[PDB]
């Protein structure tokens, strides 16, 4: 089996930047090499076939080069809609194989999150479990700290975060943190607070509520 090695694994660049993705084959595959783009939750789309041919309908800012073992995909001017994963693929010989992919990530200006907190619904308590949700909407960069406090007590080990894929239009992220505790515990305490720390905020922002208000 021919191995294709893509580097780097992940690449960050600013809109307008000239970007170069590389593919190395473990053996000489001449020009029998294709490039695909895949956006999260979507099927791949062909960009370049046989090393250097731009597929019909693909924007001209994409170009491909190389032969033998060393190949490049070049994006002459990175656009926000370009975020996603890029794969090379070889058909010199069966089995057909793909590179492990290079993820492209946009660098943009800082943008502070808007923060919202949600108490558990009545239907859910009715069933013995309490989920408290914190939402950080449309921010950049991705790194954020979300700290839970119950009656001012710093919580840990009972929350999970999820983060959206980088937005294709404005290159921001959104994040949710879910604090889960039993109905018993939720009923113990009164003040529930989400404290968010982020580069776009001059100081931590807190959203909270009082149970049953």
């Amino acid at each position: 089996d021919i191995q294709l090695t893509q580097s780097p694994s992940s690449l960050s660049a600013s809109v307008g930047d000239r970007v170069t993705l590389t593919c190395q084959a473990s053996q000489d595959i001449r020009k029998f090499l294709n490039w695909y783009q895949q956006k999260p939750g979507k099927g791949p789309k062909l960009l370049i076939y046989d090393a250097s041919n731009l597929q019909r309908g693909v924007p001209s800012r994409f170009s491909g080069g190389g032969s033998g073992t060393d190949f490049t995909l070049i994006i002459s001017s990175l656009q926000p809609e370009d975020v996603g994963t890029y794969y090379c693929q070889q058909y010199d010989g069966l089995p057909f194989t793909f590179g492990g992919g290079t993820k492209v990530v946009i660098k943009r200006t800082v943008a502070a999150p808007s923060v919202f907190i949600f108490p558990p619904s009545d239907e859910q308590l009715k069933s013995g479990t309490a989920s408290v949700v914190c939402l950080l909407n449309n921010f950049y960069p991705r790194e954020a700290k979300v700290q839970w406090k119950v009656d001012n007590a710093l919580q840990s080990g009972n929350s999970q975060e999820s983060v959206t894929e980088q937005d294709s239009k404005d290159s921001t992220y959104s994040l949710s943190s879910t604090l889960t505790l039993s109905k018993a515990d939720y009923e113990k305490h009164k003040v529930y607070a989400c404290e968010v720390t982020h580069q776009g905020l001059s100081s931590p922002v807190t959203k909270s509520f009082n149970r049953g208000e």
Binding site: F32, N34, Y36, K42, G43, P44, K45, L46, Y49, D50, Q55, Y87, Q89, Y91, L94, P95, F96, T97, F98, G99, G100, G101, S114, V115, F116, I117, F118, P119, P120, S121, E123, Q124, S127, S131, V133, L135, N137, Q160, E161, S162, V163, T164, E165, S174, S176, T178, T180, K207, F209
Partner: protein
């Protein structure tokens, strides 16, 4: 251009069998349809890259398989229906993933001219389907509970309000969420599912509306179709 659409995916026990289909529509140069082309099946395990599985030429010949599925999977096609099939047997946990059918670009046969390309080119995958999900697991399906994430007074941040649905405790992936039957799309974020310690998934969908909202949750493996109205506390 030719278009592809896979189907047949679902949750199955290890050891069981399952048949995927792929239907071609549209057309390319010279009004060619899928039956003029060689086609492969390609899969993608959760969070991983792409793995070629099998190829079949336009006329049904020159079949080959990746070692990982040789002797268990069988590729075939019915050109009268412009349909491709992948018959999977003796499935294992590591067969889990999204399965794509993918058309190779070079024209391989023209029945109306009695022409057939001498060789199987197997060049670039110029058309892919949207994929169909296969989950192979011993665990039984569980449908989601849907709870409202209710906007409250003082919740305004920026100039906007947020509301949502908490889709909790389901297996396996995936669930789809829409809002107001798809009439509301601006400002919607549906988060990636997180695996909980319980072994069940949980996910939230939220929407931001400036300063009647219904979320429609679908989980096919459990035949779940829920519409939950979300109103202020």
């Amino acid at each position: 251009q030719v278009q592809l659409q896979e189907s047949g995916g679902g949750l199955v026990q290890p050891g069981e069998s399952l048949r995927l289909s792929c239907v071609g529509s549209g057309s390319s140069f010279g009004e060619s349809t899928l039956s003029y082309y060689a086609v492969s099946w390609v899969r993608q395990a959760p969070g991983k890259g792409l793995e070629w599985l099998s190829i079949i030429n336009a006329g049904g010949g020159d079949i080959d398989y990746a070692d990982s599925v040789e002797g268990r999977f069988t590729i075939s096609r019915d050109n009268s229906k412009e349909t491709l099939y992948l018959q999977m047997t003796n499935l294992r946990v590591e067969d889990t993933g999204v399965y794509y059918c993918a058309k190779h670009m070079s024209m391989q046969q023209v029945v109306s001219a009695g022409w057939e390309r001498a060789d199987l080119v197997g060049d670039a995958f110029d058309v892919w389907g949207q994929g169909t999900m296969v989950t192979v697991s011993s665990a039984s399906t569980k449908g989601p509970s849907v709870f409202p994430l209710a906007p409250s007074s003082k919740s305004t941040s920026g100039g906007t309000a947020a509301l949502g649905c908490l889709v909790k405790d389901y297996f396996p992936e995936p669930v789809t969420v829409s809002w107001n039957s798809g009439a509301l799309t601006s400002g919607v974020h549906t988060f990636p599912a997180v695996l909980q310690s319980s072994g069940l998934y949980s996910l939230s969908s939220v929407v931001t509306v400036p300063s009647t909202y219904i979320c429609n949750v679908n989980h096919k493996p459990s035949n779940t179709k829920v519409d939950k109205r979300v109103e202020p506390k």
